[PDB]
């Protein structure tokens, strides 16, 4: 390994294909090419589900299982439960002094999320402030590399900004994380939307059966105006093609259906039927891996408790350097 | 010692006659009819002193010395360093979900502080949400009684609202704090301004030599319309008489001085000379104990390290109930 990479998810439900193409398979590969930390963002989940704590609790082990089923080896990845690392909240408080309300107010991702949630000015303080909580996560674990979807760059950049101001004001003991950009943008939902999410109900979960995956693909949005096979169709806006573009290994094969489709002799069903097995092929192992851990629940809890202990040790080391850099009384 | 009282100060400079009249005297009283905790809030002090960590650090011990000098008994009061109790930062983050940005912006006392600070919109985030970290301080130490001036009432009411919301959402595990209202009007500065402050340069510190006190009193604003002794002078607005009301043991004398002053023949000199005698009597025992704790520096450190340990333990207990009430993973 080499760089410390920090990635994570708000435990609110089971992971889906979006996480897969979006990042899971990426960390699966940088897992032996670096020191991977996966944060089950328990606390950040509550800025949104503070009134559904049961929901979050249940999903920590659920997402950890998704992690294991996806190919993350317990011997190479450190899984950490955020709430069991209070050092993160402590650094979040110190970090809140390094940024202004106005600056937090212009974060494009949080702004859209607020508008989507319908909060108005009645935004929960913890949610409005979550980007700095993420900044604390990154710096506390000493992460130098952070995979970021095109959508999470503002947060990465604000972390670098907070980290830089911290090093200048106190002592340079924090590392500025760099971003790792990806190719496949936010995998769209079955809906045809831009975001795939169990909330939106347009998702294919990693634990869905072979039947459900097929069903999901069959109901997947395709292309209006294209009423019957024969007719010519267009790829743009069609989620089946952007799906194949992230789950199908043979592009020469992909670019192929793209030709016929634009012509008239490739029924939407054919594209779908094909895609459903390209998905079944990428999921086949995942299902069997899941089964293994489902039978070995003790192991899942192991992965989580051992990873958390390990991550806390790193967080505590960093906070020690932080508290002395800040000249807090006693250090 | 029945109800638990929590009071505090942000360590940013030495304490002065304003703190003595408006809080410390009552505090020396409370340590005998309650379990008194006094928080050296260096975390909160950093909300606006994040660019001067050294100043805050050096004032933790300096204010503790002032507490001792003022008569706070190391055997009756628990003095804790906010910094040393990370549980407070942990609880503030969870409390952040129970309040809206909208409601935080409406706080009249923080709104005025932001106005006097001149931040504009460039308000540091830590400062904007400091009322919540304070609600965390109260709830964590399990305080049921909090001395308050009508200026800190919205801080208190907001703690009450947060405690209530936390109890309804999770479990009724936090004690609702009750106010111990005012201490009668705040002491004005030497120049008659509404506020006494080292920054405004119109304060008498508890540590000032009997000499210095004398000098500061002589330079006091009085009555712009009073020019010589023979002339009648005004009492209202005259801080010299406001000082006399707050510390002169016998009102019969204060009234007589007031009378003769409005009449004529009583110059500012005689009046101030008497004020010096009264302040030296109130301050004398404060200087002696202060001097003592200067010989026995370990005694001051002992006062803070021990109170902190007790405080830390109390906060750990509350967080335990908090983590279980919130159904956090592993609790
Ligand atoms: N002046 C500080 C004093 C303080 C800090 N933390 C506290 C907690 C409880 C009561 C008072 C305080 C304030 O506005 O709060």
Curated annotation (Swiss-Prot), chains A, B:
Induction: The level of expression increases 2.2-fold, 5 hours after exposure to radiation, and returns to near a base line 5 hours later.
Pfam name, any one: tRNA-synt_1b
Reactions the enzyme catalyzes: tRNA(Trp) + L-tryptophan + ATP = L-tryptophyl-tRNA(Trp) + AMP + diphosphate + H(+)
Motif 'KMSKS' region per record, residues: 195-199
Name of the gene this protein is made from: trpS2
Subunit structure: Homodimer. Forms a complex with nos; one homodimer of trpS2 binds one homodimer of nos.
Record's miscellaneous remark: This protein may not be involved in protein biosynthesis.
Name of the protein in its database record: Tryptophan--tRNA ligase 2
Ligand binding (ATP): 198
UniProt motif 'HIGH' region: location: 11-19
Keyword tags: Aminoacyl-tRNA synthetase, ATP-binding, Ligase, Nucleotide-binding, Protein biosynthesis
Protein's job: Catalyzes the formation of 5'adenyl-Trp and tRNA(Trp) but with 5-fold less activity than TrpRS. Increases the solubility of the nitric oxide synthase oxygenase (nos), as well as its affinity for substrate L-arginine and its nitric-oxide synthase activity. The complex between trpS2 and nos catalyzes the regioselective nitration of tryptophan at the 4-position.
InterPro entries: aa-tRNA-synth_I_CS, aa-tRNA-synth_Ic, Rossmann-like_a/b/a_fold, Trp-tRNA-ligase, Trp-tRNA_synthetase
A biological process term (GO) from this entry: tryptophanyl-tRNA aminoacylation
Keyword Transport listed: no
GO terms under cellular component: cytoplasm
GO function terms (MF aspect): ATP binding; tryptophan-tRNA ligase activity
Entry-linked SUPFAM superfamilies: Nucleotidylyl transferase
Family affiliation: Belongs to the class-I aminoacyl-tRNA synthetase family.
Domain of life: Bacteria
Enzyme Commission (EC) number: 6.1.1.2
């Amino acid at each position: 390994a080499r760089p410390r990479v920090l990635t994570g998810d708000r435990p609110t439900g089971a992971l889906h294909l979006g996480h897969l193409a979006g990042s899971l398979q990426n960390r699966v590969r940088l897992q032996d090419e670096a020191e991977l930390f996966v944060l089950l963002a328990d606390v950040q989940a509550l800025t949104d589900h503070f009134d559904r704590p049961e929901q979050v609790r249940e999903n920590v082990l659920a997402v950890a299982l998704d992690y294991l089923a996806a190919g993350l080896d317990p011997q190479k990845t450190t899984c950490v439960v955020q709430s069991a690392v209070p050092e993160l909240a402590e650094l979040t408080v110190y970090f809140l002094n390094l940024v202004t309300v106005s600056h937090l107010r212009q974060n494009p991702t949080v702004k859209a999320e607020i508008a989507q949630k319908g909060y108005g000015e009645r935004v929960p303080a913890g949610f409005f402030v979550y980007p700095v909580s993420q900044a604390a996560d990154i710096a506390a674990f000493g992460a130098t590399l952070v995979p970021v979807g095109d959508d999470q760059l503002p947060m990465l950049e604000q972390t670098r900004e907070i980290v830089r101001r911290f090093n200048a004001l106190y002592a340079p003991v924090l590392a500025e994380p760099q971003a790792q950009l990806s190719r496949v943008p936010r995998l769209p939902g079955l809906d045809g939307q831009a975001k795939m999410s169990k909330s939106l109900g347009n998702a294919i979960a990693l634990g869905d059966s072979a039947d459900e995956v097929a069903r999901k693909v069959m109901g997947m949005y395709t292309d209006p105006g294209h009423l019957r096979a024969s007719d010519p169709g267009r790829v743009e806006g069609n989620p089946v093609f952007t799906f194949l573009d992230a789950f199908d290994p043979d592009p020469a094969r992909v670019q192929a259906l793209k030709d016929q489709y634009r012509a008239g002799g490739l029924g939407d069903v054919k594209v779908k039927k094909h895609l459903i097995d390209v998905l079944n092929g990428v999921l086949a192992p995942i299902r069997t891996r899941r089964a293994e851990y489902e039978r070995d629940p003790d192991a899942v809890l192991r992965f989580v408790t051992e990873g958390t202990a390990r991550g806390r040790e790193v967080a505590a080391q960093t906070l020690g350097q932080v508290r002395r850099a800040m000249r807090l009384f006693g250090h």
